Amino acid sequence: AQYEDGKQYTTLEKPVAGAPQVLEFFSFFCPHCYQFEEVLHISDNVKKKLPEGVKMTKYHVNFMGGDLGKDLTQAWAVAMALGVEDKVTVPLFEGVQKTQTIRSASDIRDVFINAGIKGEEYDAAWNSFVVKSLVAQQEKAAADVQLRGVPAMFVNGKYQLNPQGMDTSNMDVFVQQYADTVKYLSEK
Ligand SMILES: O=C(O)c1sc(Cc2ccccc2)nc1-c1ccccc1
Q1: Listed disulfide bonds for this chain?
Q2: What is the 3-state secondary structure (H, E, C) of 85-122?
Q3: Angle at the Cα of 143 (from 183 to 75), degrees rounded to 5?
Q4: 10 Å Cβ neighbour count for 33?
Q5: Considering only CA atoms, which residue is closest to atom 5 of ligand 1?
């Protein structure tokens, strides 16, 4: 077939019921995640190929970067709670990987302040149980799929994208193949 289990995607041996339709995992410490966001814009190109108002979810992971990696999962929970993902994603990537100016939870906070989130509002969210619950959702979802690597994408809790078997000589063709595969998987 043109799409083959084991090739463009793997199929979850233990499928995860009641999982989000399109679920991506990333870390601000992961270089390929950096590219998926700023160079390839995977998420928006997947979104443009899927039906209206499909639910796309994106979660940070703890298993890279030690203490600060776990701080970033809580900060991503803040970003989700406030709906400011689009304003902090690039400066967080650049602060961790480009300028290496993010060394502490305070440095993470400066990124939200600079992006226009009020200091009071960031701190209330950071300390909120709504955010603690978002942190728990992120960890649980990663545990449900025994995640050990990013970037990762899962469709309908049953199929995992496998980009390692895709031609990467042309960025635009790669993105299109990634997005068309997700669409194919969502339609199964
Ligand atoms: O496997 C690889 O080498 C590449 S390349 C890439 C972005 C890109 C595409 C085309 C040209 C330049 C960059 N992402 C990955 C990747 C690696 C491991 C897990 C998930 C994705």
Answers
A1: 30-33
A2: HHHHHHHHHHHHHHCCCCCCHHHHHHHHHHCCCCHHHH
A3: 85
A4: 23
A5: 168
To test ligand 1's pocket by mutation, which of 168, 171, 173 has the most ligand atoms within 8 angstroms of CB?
A: 168
| CATH H superfamily, domain 1-188 | Glutaredoxin (3.40.30.10)
- Give resolution, Å, one decimal: 2.0
Instruction: Confirm if 37 and 93 have CB atoms less than 8 A apart.
Output: yes
The structure's method of determination equals: X-ray
Helices marked H in the chain: 31-34, 42-49, 66-82, 85-93, 105-114, 119-126, 129-144, 171-186
Radius of gyration of the chain (CA): 17
Q: Is the dihedral of CA 112, 117, 119, 123 positive or negative?
A: negative
